[PDB]
Amino acid sequence: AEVTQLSNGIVVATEHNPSAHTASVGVVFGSGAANENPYNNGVSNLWKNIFLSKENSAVAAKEGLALSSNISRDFQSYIVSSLPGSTDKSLDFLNQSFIQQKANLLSSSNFEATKKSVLKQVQDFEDNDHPNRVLEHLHSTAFQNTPLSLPTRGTLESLENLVVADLESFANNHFLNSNAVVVGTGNIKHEDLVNSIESKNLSLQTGTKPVLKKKAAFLGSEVRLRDDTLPKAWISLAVEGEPVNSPNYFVAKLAAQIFGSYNAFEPASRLQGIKLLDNIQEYQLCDNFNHFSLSYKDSGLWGFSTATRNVTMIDDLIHFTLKQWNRLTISVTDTEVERAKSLLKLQLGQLYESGNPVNDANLLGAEVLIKGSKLSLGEAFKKIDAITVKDVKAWAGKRLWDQDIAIAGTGQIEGLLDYMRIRSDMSMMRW
Amino acid sequence: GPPSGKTYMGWWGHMGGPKQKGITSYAVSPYAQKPLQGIFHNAVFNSFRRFKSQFLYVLIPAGIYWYWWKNGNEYNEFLYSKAGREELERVNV
Ligand SMILES: CCCCCCCCCCCO[C@@H]1O[C@H](CO)[C@@H](O[C@H]2O[C@H](CO)[C@@H](O)[C@H](O)[C@H]2O)[C@H](O)[C@H]1O
Numbered sequence A: 001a002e003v004t005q006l007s008n009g010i011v012v013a014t015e016h017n018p019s020a021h022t023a024s025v026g027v028v029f030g031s032g033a034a035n036e037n038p039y040n041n042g043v044s045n046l047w048k049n050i051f052l053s054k055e056n057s058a059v060a061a062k063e064g065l066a067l068s069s070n071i072s073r074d075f076q077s078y079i080v081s082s083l084p085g086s087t088d089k090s091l092d093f094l095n096q097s098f099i100q101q102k103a104n105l106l107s108s109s110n111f112e113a114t115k116k117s118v119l120k121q122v123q124d125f126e127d128n129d130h131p132n133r134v135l136e137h138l139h140s141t142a143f144q145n146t147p148l149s150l151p152t153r154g155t156l157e158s159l160e161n162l163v164v165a166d167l168e169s170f171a172n173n174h175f176l177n178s179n180a181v182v183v184g185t186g187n188i189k190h191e192d193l194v195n196s197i198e199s200k201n202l203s204l205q206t207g208t209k210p211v212l213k214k215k216a217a218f219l220g221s222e223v224r225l226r227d228d229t230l231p232k233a234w235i236s237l238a239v240e241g242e243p244v245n246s247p248n249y250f251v252a253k254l255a256a257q258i259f260g261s262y263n264a265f266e267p268a269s270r271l272q273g274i275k276l277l278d279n280i281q282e283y284q285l286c287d288n289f290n291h292f293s294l295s296y297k298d299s300g301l302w303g304f305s306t307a308t309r310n311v312t313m314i315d316d317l318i319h320f321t322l323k324q325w326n327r328l329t330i331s332v333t334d335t336e337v338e339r340a341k342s343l344l345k346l347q348l349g350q351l352y353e354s355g356n357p358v359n360d361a362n363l364l365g366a367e368v369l370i371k372g373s374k375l376s377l378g379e380a381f382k383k384i385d386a387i388t389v390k391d392v393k394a395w396a397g398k399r400l401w402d403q404d405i406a407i408a409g410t411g412q413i414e415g416l417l418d419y420m421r422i423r424s425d426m427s428m429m430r431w
Numbered sequence B: 001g002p003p004s005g006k007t008y009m010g011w012w013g014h015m016g017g018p019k020q021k022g023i024t025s026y027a028v029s030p031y032a033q034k035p036l037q038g039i040f041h042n043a044v045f046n047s048f049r050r051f052k053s054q055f056l057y058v059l060i061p062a063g064i065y066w067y068w069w070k071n072g073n074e075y076n077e078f079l080y081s082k083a084g085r086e087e088l089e090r091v092n093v
Helices: A043-051 A054-061 A087-098 A108-128 A130-142 A164-174 A190-199 A249-259 A276-280 A314-330 A334-352 A357-368 A377-385 A389-399 A419-424 B049-079 B082-091
Strands: A004-007 A011-016 A023-029 A066-071 A076-082 A180-186 A221-226 A233-240 A261-263 A288-295 A300-308 A406-411 B025-028
Touching: A004 A190, A011 A190, A011 A357, A023 A087, A023 A357, A043 A066, A043 A076, A043 A108, A043 A164, A054 A066, A054 A087, A076 A087, A076 A357, A087 A190, A108 A130, A130 A221, A130 A233, A130 A300, A130 A406, A180 A190, A180 A357, A233 A314, A249 A288, A249 A300, A249 A314, A249 A334, A249 A377, A249 A389, A276 A314, A300 A314, A314 A389, A314 A419, A334 A357, A334 A377, A334 A389, B049 B082
Parallel strands: A011 A180, A221 A406
Antiparallel strands: A004 A011, A023 A076, A023 A180, A066 A076, A221 B025, A233 A300, A233 A406, A261 A288, A288 A300
């Protein structure tokens, strides 16, 4: 992970990789679902889909280019992939699609079909993707009536009320130069991509700043979507976590790594050095779980998600997990922190250094849009190696011990007890 | 453990009710709610609700019995006063 960034109005950032074999060029905006309203919610997912439209994709396919678009909470990306030399043609397609096709892609035939696609797409997700649907409701109840609560794909209600005018108004306010970063990852060199950008000119949609509003706030609450027809109980629970640029960003991630992820069906997963495993395998409290330390611009979420068929012992699953979390404040051991350090590094490694250029493009853009430059692993590893048991305890003492929680769940959740019973387990009795 | 009989109530996870689908519920942590002031805002205001709706079902029988008591109590008082010894000799033996 090595960065290089320059500017001339349009901020350009790249990251060379001599052993790439391909290259990805694109634009990333510092506005995602958290920059939408409860009524135009889904407008970004809508943009993503028209950019990947059938027509637009053919025009790129003939050019030997592959398209990619990712909608998140804080950022939004549109990336083009090609061979290392065809990079000059990728920028032409980008310039063509976002500085000329302001009405090409927004035709009544293309739009109504795309709208129809994302509509069925989202209907399916809400209908069958239980673990992600639950996790989305977790964000929805935790940050309710606040920016961070809106689902990245949007709601079926506001999705079907959208018109080309909604797409345009969003573009006019967010697809601006001051809210973007041109990204180039793969094998291409920095002092070469900027030239092709300087080769052209104009300034259509510039000078203007994006809009502002209220900041994300965590609220202790819950949303229960009971469905007895499903074969499992899917739940997600979390406390208010850390925002990107928080002093405890790495400490929180190390804490999540301590409890990690688990798949009851994979032999090696059952053997991990996570004390919680000794409590949940006796009666097989779940099929799987995974801890997380989600971080965004305004706030974060630290917690876990689980899936279980043991619908009569959900109280034990929750009880044991939260009881292990208490340990982070009062008894986490040195070895537990050292095992977490090793594995956090490993995960940060697989994330920041995959052989995939589109992954690096999204990470580069989204990061420079906040801190001004992507963080190197070498520095990340140094901060991770410096984390002490005390750091973890001090952190747990403020974000975990006797703190409000956000819960969401669907399926056979009758066995999931009331809020207070769950909230109580966030601390222990003592003299 | 031995097999005991079936009942209309089970336990957490298999309570005995019909399958539930389509109902979504929401709640907020007591820690995030206004430090309890609903003792003299929506309790004294909404007070006498349970009163004016049900009081008749209690008051009429209460009144019927109280009247019957007072009536019989006064009759007894008269029966045992000087003015009532004549009627007392009659109604008694
Ligand atoms: C039979 C008649 C006899 C009656 C005797 C009365 C007993 C009184 C016990 C009083 C307090 O016992 C005390 O309770 C509080 C919760 O209220 C516990 O607190 C625990 O939960 C609270 C949250 O609610 C956390 O903030 C706290 O960090 C945690 O330790 C505390 O650790 C325990 O020590």
